[PDB]
């Protein structure tokens, strides 16, 4: 699974003393985060599960 | 990036924030996911 966003952390000193980490800017490969699954592997294992069922 | 594949999903929100100097406030901004925020009642 991947989140292709080289984003920054514009931390803001909303004290007193204590600090808050806000979201800076979002740059890079602006794509939606997603997961990669080996399809044949899933199909194969799922089948093995169905056998039990 | 036009037109719109990302659907935004984040808003360029700004607000008068209380700082270390409890007194004079500071207009700041931050990017939030629309899953975190909700419209009350730019907006």
């Amino acid at each position, epitope marked *: 699974c991947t989140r292709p966003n080289n984003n920054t952390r514009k931390s803001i000193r909303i004290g007193p003393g204590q600090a808050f980490y806000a979201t800076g800017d979002i740059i890079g*490969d602006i794509r939606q985060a997603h997961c990669n699954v080996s399809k044949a592997t899933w199909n194969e294992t799922l089948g093995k599960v169905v056998k039990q069922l | 990036n036009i037109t719109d594949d990302m659907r935004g999903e984040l808003k360029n929100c700004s607000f008068n924030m209380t700082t270390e100097l409890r007194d004079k406030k500071q207009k700041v901004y931050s990017l939030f996911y629309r899953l975190d925020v909700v419209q009350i009642n730019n907006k």
Partner: single-chain antibody
Amino acid sequence: QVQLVQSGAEMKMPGASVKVSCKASGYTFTGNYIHWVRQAPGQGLEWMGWIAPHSGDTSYAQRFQGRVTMTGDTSLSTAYMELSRLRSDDTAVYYCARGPFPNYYGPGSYWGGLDFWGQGTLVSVSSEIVMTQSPATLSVSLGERATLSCRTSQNVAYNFAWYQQKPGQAPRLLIYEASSRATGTPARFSGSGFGTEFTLTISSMQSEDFAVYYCQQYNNWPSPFTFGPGTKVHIK
């Protein structure tokens, strides 16, 4: 908006070397791969290679690999290109160009096209060839439809793109993936094709449309990028 600004021009004889720089603004510089491409006089565009500033990985045209060096100074938001032992193939306007945004249904390098281009810097030595376009010139009146054709010496990945260029200005991307319209491009424009032959269409012409149009084949690899001679759409 996103902008790429380059260095100044030079004249060379074969055997000499040249270094050109490219400063980017408007986006996170490290986020996108930068291509180096050139366009010789009386000749079409040529791809030197690309560097990914994030990883530092690079790809060089086989033609280029020994002679060229691409560097990137991320603090500077600058990309550099240096080429020694100039030869004919060497002289042209040299352009840097950023790759496009990642696509939802894209295979690797599908976004390898040149999304945003610098104005280009001129260097002149000796001479180079590929894709073929027709007609050389297309005279039309605002309102008519324009059709442009591109014949390739090789078949393609469906990684075919068209660019619009008013001379003296940076080239601009019209269509990508043979038929996907670039953001900000009007419905008027459409593209299609397969194999060796591809075409671009403008349903109804507008005055803004007059410019030169070029086709390009792009991929992951060194030899993979190739461009056509260009077709001029002139008003009349």
